[PDB]
Structure formats: C-alpha cells, structure tokens
Amino acid sequence: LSPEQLVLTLLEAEPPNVLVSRPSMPFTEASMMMSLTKLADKELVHMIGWAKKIPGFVELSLLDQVRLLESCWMEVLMVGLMWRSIDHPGKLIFAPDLVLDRDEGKCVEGILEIFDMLLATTSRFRELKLQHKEYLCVKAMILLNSSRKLTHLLNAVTDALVWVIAKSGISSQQQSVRLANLLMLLSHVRHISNKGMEHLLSMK
Amino acid sequence: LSPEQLVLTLLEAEPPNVLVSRPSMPFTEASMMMSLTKLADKELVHMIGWAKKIPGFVELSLLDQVRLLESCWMEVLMVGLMWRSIDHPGKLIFAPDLVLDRDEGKCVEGILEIFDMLLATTSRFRELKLQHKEYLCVKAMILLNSSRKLTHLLNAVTDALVWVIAKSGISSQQQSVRLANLLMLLSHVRHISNKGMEHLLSMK
Numbered sequence A, B: 001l002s003p004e005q006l007v008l009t010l011l012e013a014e015p016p017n018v019l020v021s022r023p024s025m026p027f028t029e030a031s032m033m034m035s036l037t038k039l040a041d042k043e044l045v046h047m048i049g050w051a052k053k054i055p056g057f058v059e060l061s062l063l064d065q066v067r068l069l070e071s072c073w074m075e076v077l078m079v080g081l082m083w084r085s086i087d088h089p090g091k092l093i094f095a096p097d098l099v100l101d102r103d104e105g106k107c108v109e110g111i112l113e114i115f116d117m118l119l120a121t122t123s124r125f126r127e128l129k130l131q132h133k134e135y136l137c138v139k140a141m142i143l144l145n146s147s148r149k150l151t152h153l154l155n156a157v158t159d160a161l162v163w164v165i166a167k168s169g170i171s172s173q174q175q176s177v178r179l180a181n182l183l184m185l186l187s188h189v190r191h192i193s194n195k196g197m198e199h200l201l202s203m204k
C-alpha cells in the first residue's frame, strides 16, 4: 500500500458521528456527566470498528488488539475532540449537537481545568495549522505507538505522515521540524488523558 | 547560535561522572537501594548545573526553571542510564563503577520488572544505532518539551537534532523517519519513569 493509499483508507475509516443532544434546561453536574458518558460509550463502539479498518490491525493478535485500544482510548477520544474544536475558540465540540461553552465547565467539580487543558492544546494545534490529513495519521500513531507486525504498521503510518507533510511544499528542514512539532504535541494529549482519567476515578 | 554550535555546547555541558562503588559483599535490598539513592542524589546536583549550561535556560524565569527540572528529572536520569548501557546487553550501567547485572534486580522487591523495562528500551535504542550526538539533543528535548523563550529553546534543540540527522547521509525521507522514531522512543522513557516513580513511592 502506498502512503497516499494508506491515507485514503484512514479517511474512509473515520467513524460516523453519534446521535446526541443537549438537555434543554441548563446543565447540572448530573446531566453533564450523563451526556459525556453516553457520548463516550457510543464513541467507544465506533472506535473499535475504526481500529479494525486500519490496514494490518486485524492481522495483529487479538490480545495485542485489545491491549492497544485499552491503553490509549482516552487519548484517541481527546485528539478527535481537539480536531473537532480546532476552529472554535473557547468551545469544546464533543459532538455535532453537543457543543459546550468553556464556562459550562463550572457545572461539574474539577472539569473546568480539564476543559482548559483541552482548549489550550487545541489552540496549539490551531496555531500549527494542523491539517485534517495529518490529523488522521497522528490519531492512528497514538493507537499504535505502545512487536513485529506492529512495528511494521507504525512505520507505514509514519511514512504516511511524512508523505502528507512533503505535499505541503515547505523545505526539507521545515518538514522535519513540522514532524517533530506534531509528535511533541501528542505527548501533551497523553498528559491530559492521564488527568482526565484521574478526574474520572475520583468522581465515579 | 548554529546547530553545530548548539551541539558542541551540549557536548561540553555533560555532567561529570559520580564517585561511587559497589559494596564488596553481595547486595541486599538495603544496600542496593542505599547505592541507587546516593547515586541519584549526586546526579541530581549535577543535573541542575547541566541544565544551567543549556543556552537560554538561565534566561527563563526561575519558576519555569524549577518547574522543568522537577517534572522530568527521572526521565533525564533514565535516558542517561540507557545511553550508558547501550552497548552492554543484560547490564545497567548506573555509574562507571556501579555496573549491575540484570539478575541482581531480584535483590529488591519489584525492581526486576523496572530493570527489564529499562533494558528493553535500551535495546531499542541500540537497534536504532543511536548516536551520542543525537542522545545529547534528545536529552535536552526531554527537559524542555513541557512559553515564549521556552518554545524558542525547544525549536533550537529540534533544529540541532535535525542537523545531526542530516549529517548521517541517509535520504530525506529516511531522515524524517529517523526523527519520528527517536521522538517516539522518548514517550517510552516517560512511561518507564512513571513506573519507576510509583515503585519508589510504594517503597519509601
């Protein structure tokens, strides 16, 4: 498979959006957590089908498959949330009809800071002018950077990210730099996922 | 400062080694933890002077300075340990005269698995044929990838890593790939540092 072809299959593998909605009345700690939780449940179902569409993922052992989805699922969700909210300052686009204002974060104890960390990282991706095609490779690298067919798969995604950056036309050095900047941003997603998780544990 | 000049100052900023030694008798949980702990203490002193030699680090606010050293110190220590043990399968080179066999890990409860994670990541760096000059930039990127003079500093280190990879002579695409592989290895160091820390907490 060529890089371009790898990208095209990732593009077609995007999960469908989820059918949700904001309760008409003002959010409460209960209804906001109820909404986020139902949303994630449906996204988690679609995430499994998405990973199965990544070229070579189903050829991995069932155990490795489950292992990857299990250890980086909050990260895959957050980066999708960031991509969706990239062009909307102060807003988190959890789902097409589940758009939350930053200030709504005070509706839940301790979610405000997590919202703020998501908004900041999203702003960095915006400043970097992240492209939708680079978002697809970066998302697949989060799921896979955790040995043999796996390393092969990661390499393929990496060559697909490099091909996408080459098509932007900047210089060779600026292409390396851009690569380094995209990858260093994923470690920020890792950090916010760890805090979001602890935020969940203490909560439920 | 040119990339080459940035590298040369990092090279001269390497901390001096520490004066330590193995107790003559066979290690016990107490004497192994005593040795590791004294070693780290002295390395932690030298780490502070090293960071102060990174071009632009002292111009950062005192608060940011302390913040960086405080959040990624175990990572900077582990990557130095990995570099030192790169050419020695089954051995962790904690210090010139503090060389531990893998099997000595059973001398302390729960250290065996941490030793094993360090040895595995070290083997990956060996397979990648990590160069000492790339090790210097990667180490400085761990300390700095955590806004303005900081971003400037990180960019400078990144351009220094890219310059070092260009001098290896591989193709443009293989240079991007190599960059992506070095950076993805640092996230493994992050993970082992988290486990080593928890291992310490539960312990002391």
Ligand SMILES: CCCCN(C)C(=O)CCCCCCCCCC[C@@H]1Cc2cc(O)ccc2[C@H]2CC[C@]3(C)[C@@H](O)CC[C@H]3[C@H]12
Binding pocket: A036, A037, A039, A040, A041, A043, A044, A045, A047, A048, A069, A070, A073, A077, A078, A080, A081, A094, A111, A114, A115, A195, A196, A197, A199, A200
């Ligand atoms: C997909 C395969 C893995 C499935 N496995 C093994 C699992 O364990 C899944 C476990 C399901 C966990 C149920 C809880 C659902 C998570 C909802 C996340 C909830 C909804 C959500 C949705 C997104 O699309 C992105 C981020 C987020 C989270 C960001 C961080 C928040 C704001 C935290 O601060 C509190 C609420 C969290 C948000």
Ligand SMILES: CCCCN(C)C(=O)CCCCCCCCCC[C@@H]1Cc2cc(O)ccc2[C@H]2CC[C@]3(C)[C@@H](O)CC[C@H]3[C@H]12
Binding pocket: B036, B037, B039, B040, B041, B043, B044, B045, B047, B048, B069, B070, B073, B077, B078, B080, B081, B094, B111, B114, B115, B195, B196, B197, B199, B200
């Ligand atoms: C430098 C500025 C930061 C200083 N600050 C704010 C601090 O808090 C420093 C705190 C000092 C912590 C004291 C404990 C010393 C750490 C010794 C680490 C101990 C020695 C050591 C030395 C290395 O050069 C590399 C890794 C390592 C660790 C690897 C992971 C191990 C094997 C764990 O599984 C148990 C022992 C750990 C090893």
Ligand code: NI
Binding pocket: A016, A045, A046
């Ligand atoms: Ni569905």
Ligand code: NI
Binding pocket: A084, A086, A087, A088
């Ligand atoms: Ni939009």
Ligand code: NI
Binding pocket: B016, B045, B046
């Ligand atoms: Ni000294």
Ligand code: NI
Binding pocket: B084, B086, B087, B088
């Ligand atoms: Ni050696």
